[PDB]
Amino acid sequence: GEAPNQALLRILKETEFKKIKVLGSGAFGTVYKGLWIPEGEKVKIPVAIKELREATSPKANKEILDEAYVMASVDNPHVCRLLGICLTSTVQLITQLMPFGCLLDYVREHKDNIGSQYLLNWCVQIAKGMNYLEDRRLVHRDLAARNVLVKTPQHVKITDFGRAKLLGAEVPIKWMALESILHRIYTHQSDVWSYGVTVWELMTFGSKPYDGIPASEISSILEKGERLPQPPICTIDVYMIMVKCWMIDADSRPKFRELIIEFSKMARDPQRYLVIQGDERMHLPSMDEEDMDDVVDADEYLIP
Numbered sequence: 656g657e658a659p660n661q662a663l664l665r666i667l668k669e670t671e672f673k674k675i676k677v678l679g680s681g682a683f684g685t686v687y688k689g690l691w692i693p694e695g696e697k698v699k700i701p702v703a704i705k706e707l708r709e710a711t712s713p714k715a716n717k718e719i720l721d722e723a724y725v726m727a728s729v730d731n732p733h734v735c736r737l738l739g740i741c742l743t744s745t746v747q748l749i750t751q752l753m754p755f756g757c758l759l760d761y762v763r764e765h766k767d768n769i770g771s772q773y774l775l776n777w778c779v780q781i782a783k784g785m786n787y788l789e790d791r792r793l794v795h796r797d798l799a800a801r802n803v804l805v806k807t808p809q810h811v812k813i814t815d816f817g818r819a820k821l822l823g824a825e826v827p828i829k830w831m832a833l834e835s836i837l838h839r840i841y842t843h844q845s846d847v848w849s850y851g852v853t854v855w856e857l858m859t860f861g862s863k864p865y866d867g868i869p870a871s872e873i874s875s876i877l878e879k880g881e882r883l884p885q886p887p888i889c890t891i892d893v894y895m896i897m898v899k900c901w902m903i904d905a906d907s908r909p910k911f912r913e914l915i916i917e918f919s920k921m922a923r924d925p926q927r928y929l930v931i932q933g934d935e936r937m938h939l940p941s942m943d944e945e946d947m948d949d950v951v952d953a954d955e956y957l958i959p
């Protein structure tokens with residue numbers, strides 16, 4: 656039996672928040688950095704406002720509203736915080752601002768400053784995010800480094816719920832389990848597979864999986880028993896763990912709760928598990944106008 660989902664969908668006034676700079680555009684919608692001054696409360700909240708690609712085809716609204724449905728029903732430090740929606744014309748989704756953006760980009764744009772303590776910490780945090788979705792019986796179906804966002808370089812969060820489904824219910828080829836490519840079976844275990852690939856994107860500083868190999872070939876490669884190569888920086892311990900996420904027997908893959916444990920152990924001696932050139936000596940970052948006196952982060956903004 657299912658418990659009743661008593662999350663709150665918060666409807667926001669367009670006047671309660673001011674935009675400030677475009678962030679993303681084209682591909683689908685149109686994201687903005689902005690601030691959100693709820694009602695009368697004397698707080699300001701860095702937000703991302705995602706108003707979808709103008710022209711408002713009934714198909715598009717029912718699609719972002721599901722995202723918001725899902726995002727409103729999740730609550731975990733490692734899953735992207737949804738603040739509310741706004742019913743304007745085209746429908747604004749309002750989420751917590753992740754100032755550092757896509758984690759796939761972050762790693763590409765910072766290789767030379769990223770060290771094992773960070774890489775292993777991201778691994779744990781995503782494993783936690785995923786374990787939590789599991790707890791709430793959700794299957795993400797689109798885990799990848801492009802779908803993890805960076806709030807600060809020590810703190811990442813899983814995003815993109817535009818494909819999430821409940822387990823038991825009813826295309827990014829290079830991240831998918833094999834049961835998924837062949838029979839569209841998706842399970843929490845098909846999520847572990849893609850975790851495997853996400854981790855590999857991170858350890859190779861954001862390479863592209865099976866660069867070259869075009870998508871039609873993939874199921875065949877995998878069925879023959881080929882997997883992605885061991886990244887240069889990876890000890891066999893780390894790489895062994897990727898490999899197990901890529902087993903064919905789904906039930907032989909590990910569980911997110913185990914990944915948490917394993918990376919967490921490794922995260923206590925980072926340098927034993929990832930061999931990075933110039934590791935010891937590496938520091939990373941920690942946000943515009945001046946009226947930043949009343950700014951609180953969404954993570955510290957809580958609702959009764």
Ligand SMILES: CN[C@@H]1C[C@H]2O[C@@](C)([C@@H]1OC)n1c3ccccc3c3c4c(c5c6c(n2c5c31)CCCC6)C(=O)N=C4
Pocket residue numbers: 678679680686703705750751752753754755756757760801804
């Ligand atoms: C390639 N990478 C892009 C950088 C960026 O535009 C994109 C389109 C891309 O990401 C994957 N994008 C989104 C696309 C679809 C849904 C949400 C976002 C998105 C968000 C945020 C983004 C930021 C930045 N993008 C943010 C966001 C760029 C740096 C500031 C933060 C953010 O804080 N919350 C959501």
